[PDB]
Ligand binder design. Structure first.
Ligand SMILES: *[C@@H]1O[C@H](CO)[C@@H](O[C@@H]2O[C@H](CO)[C@@H](O)[C@H](O)[C@H]2NC(C)=O)[C@H](O)[C@H]1NC(C)=O
Ligand SMILES: *[C@@H]1O[C@H](CO)[C@@H](O[C@@H]2O[C@H](CO)[C@@H](O)[C@H](O)[C@H]2NC(C)=O)[C@H](O)[C@H]1NC(C)=O
Ligand SMILES: *[C@@H]1O[C@H](CO)[C@@H](O[C@@H]2O[C@H](CO)[C@@H](O)[C@H](O)[C@H]2NC(C)=O)[C@H](O)[C@H]1NC(C)=O
Ligand SMILES: *[C@@H]1O[C@H](CO)[C@@H](O[C@@H]2O[C@H](CO)[C@@H](O)[C@H](O)[C@H]2NC(C)=O)[C@H](O)[C@H]1NC(C)=O
Ligand SMILES: *[C@@H]1O[C@H](CO)[C@@H](O[C@@H]2O[C@H](CO)[C@@H](O)[C@H](O)[C@H]2NC(C)=O)[C@H](O)[C@H]1NC(C)=O
Ligand SMILES: *[C@@H]1O[C@H](CO)[C@@H](O[C@@H]2O[C@H](CO)[C@@H](O)[C@H](O)[C@H]2NC(C)=O)[C@H](O)[C@H]1NC(C)=O
Ligand SMILES: *[C@@H]1O[C@H](CO)[C@@H](O[C@@H]2O[C@H](CO)[C@@H](O)[C@H](O)[C@H]2NC(C)=O)[C@H](O)[C@H]1NC(C)=O
Ligand SMILES: *[C@H]1O[C@H](CO)[C@@H](O)[C@H](O)[C@H]1NC(C)=O
Ligand SMILES: *[C@H]1O[C@H](CO)[C@@H](O)[C@H](O)[C@H]1NC(C)=O
Ligand SMILES: *[C@H]1O[C@H](CO)[C@@H](O)[C@H](O)[C@H]1NC(C)=O
Ligand SMILES: *[C@H]1O[C@H](CO)[C@@H](O)[C@H](O)[C@H]1NC(C)=O
Ligand SMILES: [Ca+2]
Ligand SMILES: [Ca+2]
Ligand SMILES: [Ca+2]
Ligand SMILES: [Ca+2]
Lengths: 448, 448, 448, 448
């Protein structure tokens, strides 16, 4: 279990609106990395997922032996432990168990989540190029693995209702899932088949960020038309790219009890990887901007239960125009107009301030994370702190040109020294060992 | 506990003299590294120690926050686990516990050793520059820490007899120690004070490798004179630099039961870092060439017990002229003549063949490890396989100019697939994160 | 252990009814304070708890680094020792052990109690403003820590039955607890949820001090109506503010063996901080007047055991109209009429005379303590001796305007010189170091 | 025993000459004070002594019940404990034992010193006004008390040789003593009788600080004449006011084994209170400027042993002109010319840099402490850091006019966080409780 210095500083809004204005990033602190490195030049470690909770943390990432492309073989590294203070005062993520799922099953796009006494991981089994998954009417196999700290492992092949013949594909969003009211929730996305109820109920729906108008040159009518079309991809088997949540009851005999809950396309953008968070009793969702809007997307999710079962989800977006992401073509970090896009990067963000603390939801929100500072390339990884309109603190890592990919940010407070530490897990392109080196950078978020 | 595939392939001579002739290094295999990385550009991780045994393995290294020089602050990372096969067939070092001794005590030059149910680590507490330790008549504080897999930790400040007023300094050799007949043996070295019994008994003693004559241009008389003098250092407080073994009975209340057993300078070269090995029932010793002879030094150690206590050690050197080490001045990799030197690097070697299997001890010995291929710089790390006179297989890592430091090599056999794997733990100078990146390279040693 | 001069003069009624009439406060005596001072101008030390017993005494208070408001960080200072005579004849509280619980867990409103061989402390973990605790249906975490004189420390998170889903919050009364018949009893208070058994059983109950009629201008019917309503607070999440006792068996593995025993609202006023005393074999309770009645509240508690377990408590009030406390609005020291109030200060009182010694319980009771002599401000700290209707001896400390807060009074007798000493622990507002300076004033209570 | 974070950061020079130039005082940190407060307005706590060592610390001060003048009654408070880190990272002086010597013996001017397993305190028994001690040919009674942590107390009346009929009076310097090579050394001072060997051997000797010339307007001849005369006081019974060291072997049966070692008046100024320090293996002495030179006086003391017994002491002054002290008349902080003076205050200083590290002893020395910033009054207590000529960092405490008296400064390093903390024990005049409040201020000495 985590040290007494952290058990009460996890999953919360750490600063008041007033304090968010005077926040800044401290120097990077040096701790023993708890994320394993490749031991060959071409070894590839990518797609991390990290979950932290009151009692412990869970970590995982995919390992491919040669290069980063392979749809036949890969192993999945899983790790878990606690946080404890060092004599310098800052955190040390102590690993208490390690696992390396290496058995021939190609588990991909895995999302992990802390659960009482262990970790629950959700993956899909890849047997062909991603694009082929969207064309095949059959969805990939889905699996959720529970790894207890007592070393018991239970893996199940799940078949949630409304997936077969509805979704051509279904993937975990790779971002962490969360344990909420006895259920484990995972972010999901994929492509829905034309003519299905979902498709029909989703018909004519679209979402446009509050701050697009002022920045977009097209008129309202044109925007609405392009927005509606951005949810359908001809390149990906002509499917409606949908975002959603997978809810699984915490059981060791899961089969078809997990529920697929898709977001209304009236509240969310085109489906993409994502991450679920927990701030107090509130669930939040991060959605990768793989569509036309290149800015960070965060939503407060309201979950409805009917007979003790999640029955519907509603998402309220925190309006911002800050922290863009590198895209391709007419969907670079400079784009502001609706249209169909299918490019981007995963770069979640952590809210240091409560969006509900302002009379108008998210009118003044502060968040932190990392982003690739460039219009179209995955270059210049930069850690930052920002509000809805501007970046108020930032520090690029390495020299310009430095390649990087995804970034997962998590913050917690030391209730002992009363300081907030954030960990920025960034996939860095390395020249020495392996294609990438997933690094858990850690630094303090100073008030002043 | 280790997988059934390894419990019977540990600490042995894996090949016959005939087979050693046809051995070669396979490609480097990619596994999740079990050695933690620094998370800042200037963070320094150095001086690793690794012990593997039938049941499990122990690992540790020193961590300094800024740069690699600091005689006030450092933390020591400890790790332990087992070996298990992956679906590709090769090993995966599974970490089952992690520890980060961070409390203000500056533990340095630590040597670690596997023990039933945990690890035993030996360190000395550094409070001043190394050179100052040799000038001060008082030896640094010595400590042995026992870390059980059940998470109990017992640390003791030891005061073995014959240290106070005999040794001005005393350090663990950083190389792994071994668990032999109920005792934990650690390699040690340091400086002895003039006029002490040890000094007197050591007087006029010297050792000259069997293969020096043919390579040295000085006459026998001149060599013997220079050799005798190479054991005394005016730069290091005018002490006799001595090598030896620290024997501690496996107890949780250690005080003065550990015994300091110095090697006869008639059988070993000037004191230096070292490592102890176990091949079957035989103990072996590796001695860093920090003196005039720049070639790999291995010895079969014969331990004598008197009343259930180690009473004396004898060392028989495996005569070789292979695998040189970068030195400074007239002590570069090209030196062959006796004289006083105090330069070099730690680069142990693993014997793949039994030296006692030949009518004349070590007449045809094969070993493997890594070395820095250059005369005076710590550059061009190269993994190899060699016999007494030549390198019969080798592969440099990275491009020329690549900086590196120490190298610890360990081999074991997969009794399942019947292949030998060796792990080469090399301190690599990295440009991205940290001063060094200690990498556990792993590859197979192929017969053919 | 305490000196022979005090082991037989602890926890008793020291004077007879006749003697109480001729009692007076001697001069303040100067002894080395055993309560630690802050070392910064804004450092805050508040909320002390003190327990004295035949063998020794226990002391504790909360420390906040900046100012007196913080619901994230605080440390708790614990101290313990004995009493021994000085050459001047008066007491000296000799500290034999000190502890500073500083680890990130925000322990608040702690109550301490002497136990054979150490101290037992009860605290709740604060993670948000007090008011928020009443609105949240979940109660704060509860903990009891046992600190043995032999330096062993055992802390447990307790979950007594009937708390979850019954009490929205639960706090220790900060006043000392007591060790009675093998159990440790602590005063508690908090808010109960509407619709719960407790709430229902407590419905329509109210208590009115015997001496209110003669001083209140409202008629009996109006008083009863207002009294009934004074137990419910809309400002504090619409909960029934309840007072009670927490009974814990003296064990090192406490979990859910502690029992919550609430007082009947027919015998006690609205819940508030409190303190438990021991006079001979009788347990007494002090209840802070945080409601409409501004006078000192003391009750003789009768505890019922069923199968060796505390099963119910009954409280009999010592009727008085003396020693008022500063309040706010229509609840100042001058108020005498029932109604809902939520203002006041902690100012316990020590009974120098037995209330059961008169044909009519408490018809002539004498007590001592300190109080803030003003109607609405926390000003003019004054030590006194009083009977039910009047203050028969008193001495204000400092000049008018002097700020102060809580006051804990404890008396004991020197069986050697046959004099009674009382210690008045008062939180004094200081101008030099720290927000407050908790001072253990000590003086004799003279007969004549 | 002290925490592992401090056992290796005690009694040393913490910074290099280069680093001393960039040092500054951090904010005052708030910790629970370990120095007891008075509990009456006129109670007087004065003359503290503090000793810190690798294993623990010792503290003591005098307590007079009414006012600060009394030569009949006083008690002496003794305290001892260890240092341990708090969750905020800074020190907490944990008291593990307390003692209050209250028995009628008027122990005064006590100096305390850490010793293996306890404290050794040296006091003299006062039975009359100080001035009368100088006129009486008989010296006051001398006593050394040893207080073991195991609660054994041994007090002895010592009669060292060469005191009776040589010294009219003899007092401990109140500053801490030190445990050196098996002996406890205490600073002493007093008045020597005319015609005694000491007096004669001391005849015509005088000392003039290296930096007086440049600041004094008198010529060399005049200075030497006035300097010689400054060692004799007609007001104090016409005695030679001498400074020195009392060396006692660590024994429980001390009688006349302690040795009085006076300083040569050719190396030290007129006798005064003082303190002994230990920096590594070197002993240092602080001498109160109770004479004409108003600046901080520090000396490196070289102790000579003859047959295992201290036989002579030599003192080398660290030349400075910084940190003056309030004096009276022609001896205020502005005085620079030799002459007879008998005014001043105790204000020791801690060397943060080694004086022997410069080619010319003390050419660039940095020290810290507190001083009363005013020419003649004991007002404006100010903590500072200074070099030989200037104050490079300082912060006055309280508002101008604030009265204070003595100041004892001690620094140590946290080898964990690598920061230096200094504790400044200052006697502050308080308006609330007691004449003075001896406060242990603590703050960090930052490099940058
Ligand atoms: C490790 O912990 C898990 C968590 O409880 C144990 O799981 C139980 O497994 C049994 C059957 O194997 C089920 O009937 C229980 O319902 C499970 N407990 C619950 C409710 O989670 C698991 O058995 C533990 N490992 C072992 C066997 O020691
Ligand atoms: C985000 O932060 C920026 C910078 O801190 C805010 O912009 C400042 O707004 C104030 C007025 O409130 C101006 O006085 C400053 O000049 C602005 N800074 C500059 C020059 O950019 C911005 O208001 C914040 N956005 C919000 C409200 O979320
Ligand atoms: C973890 O394993 C060790 C290894 O045995 C246990 O050590 C024993 O400790 C007790 C006292 O603590 C000794 O009296 C025994 O002799 C030790 N066993 C031996 C011979 O090694 C240790 O106690 C275990 N941890 C716990 C307490 O569960
Ligand atoms: C070490 O290995 C080398 C190379 O394998 C051995 O040298 C060979 O020796 C054979 C005779 O036994 C010759 O026929 C080859 O021509 C040699 N190789 C060359 C060209 O270098 C060497 O003998 C081995 N050293 C020993 C005996 O340990
Ligand atoms: C509390 O103390 C007061 C004062 O000591 C008592 O009042 C006195 O009562 C006697 C009669 O018993 C009168 O002769 C005095 O004149 C009263 N003193 C004055 C002038 O106030 C009072 O009776 C006591 N209250 C009780 C009975 O507890
Ligand atoms: C507390 O510790 C001291 C320190 O040793 C003990 O002192 C010993 O006392 C005996 C006689 O009382 C002497 O003969 C020894 O020489 C002392 N030890 C030394 C060398 O310091 C003391 O006895 C201890 N308290 C007790 C009695 O438990
Ligand atoms: C003590 O500190 C002062 C201030 O840091 C030193 O004075 C500075 O000396 C440098 C040259 O070495 C000048 O460039 C600065 O202008 C000086 N500061 C000022 C304006 O006072 C002083 O030299 C130090 N004394 C020593 C050498 O111990
Ligand atoms: C933050 O800093 C600004 C500028 O120094 C200051 O005025 C403001 O009060 C601070 N805000 C808070 C409440 O921390
Ligand atoms: C090794 O290889 C050589 C050359 O192919 C072969 O002649 C020899 O028999 C082999 N040695 C053994 C016994 O493995
Ligand atoms: C107390 O004092 C009164 C007045 O001097 C005296 O009459 C009375 O007897 C005393 N009471 C007792 C019993 O102490
Ligand atoms: C101290 O600070 C000065 C000014 O910033 C800098 O130039 C100097 O290098 C520092 N000195 C050291 C060695 O700390
Ligand atoms: Ca498909
Ligand atoms: Ca030494
Ligand atoms: Ca609540
Ligand atoms: Ca005298």
């Amino acid at each position: 279990i985590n040290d007494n210095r952290y058990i009460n500083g996890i999953n919360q809004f750490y600063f008041s609106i007033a304090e968010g204005r005077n926040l800044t990033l401290g120097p990077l602190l040096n701790m023993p990395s708890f994320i394993p490195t490749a031991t060959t030049p071409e070894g590839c470690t990518r797609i991390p997922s990290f979950s932290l909770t009151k009692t412990h943390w869970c970590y995982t990432h995919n390992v491919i032996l040669n290069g980063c492309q392979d749809h036949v073989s890969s192993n999945q590294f899983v790790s878990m432990g606690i946080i404890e203070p060092t004599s310098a005062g800052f955190p040390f993520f102590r690993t208490l168990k390690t696992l390396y799922l290496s058995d021939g099953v190609n588990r991909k796009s895995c999302s992990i989540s802390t659960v009482p006494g262990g970790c629950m991981m959700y993956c899909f089994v890849s047997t062909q190029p991603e694009r082929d998954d969207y064309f095949s009417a059959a969805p990939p196999e889905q699996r959720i693995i529970i790894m207890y700290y007592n070393d018991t492992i239970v893996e199940r092949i799940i078949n949630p209702p409304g997936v077969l013949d509805v979704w051509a594909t279904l993937n975990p969003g790779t971002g962490s899932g969360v344990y909420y009211l006895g259920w484990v929730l995972f972010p999901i996305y994929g492509g829905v088949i034309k003519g299905t109820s979902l498709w029909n109920n989703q018909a004519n729906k679209y979402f446009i960020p509050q701050m697009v108008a002022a920045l977009c040159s097209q008129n309202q009518a044109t925007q609405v038309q392009n927005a509606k079309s951005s949810y359908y991809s001809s390149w990906f088997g002509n499917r409606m790219i949908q975002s959603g949540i997978l809810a699984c009851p915490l059981r060791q005999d899961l089969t078809n009890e997990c529920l697929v809950l898709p977001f209304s396309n009236d509240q969310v953008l085109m489906g993409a990887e994502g991450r679920l968070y927990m701030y107090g009793d509130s669930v939040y969702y991060y959605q990768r901007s793989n569509s036309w809007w290149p800015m960070t997307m965060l939503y407060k999710v309201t979950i409805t239960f009917t007979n003790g079962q999640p029955s519907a989800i509603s998402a309220q977006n925190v309006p911002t125009q800050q922290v863009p992401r590198p895209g391709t073509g007419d969907c670079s970090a400079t784009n502001r107009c609706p249209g169909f896009c299918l490019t981007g990067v995963y770069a979640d963000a952590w809210l240091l301030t409560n969006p509900s603390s302002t009379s108008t939801f998210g009118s003044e929100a502060t968040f932190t994370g990392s982003y690739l500072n460039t219009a179209t390339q995955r270059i210049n990884p930069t850690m930052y702190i920002a509000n809805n309109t501007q970046i108020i603190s930032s520090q690029q890592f390495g020299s310009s040109g430095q390649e990087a990919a995804y970034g997962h940010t998590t913050c917690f407070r030391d209730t002992g020294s009363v300081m907030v530490y954030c960990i920025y897990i960034i996939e860095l392109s390395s020249s020495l060992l392996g294609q990438f080196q997933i690094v858990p950078f850690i630094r303090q978020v100073t008030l002043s």
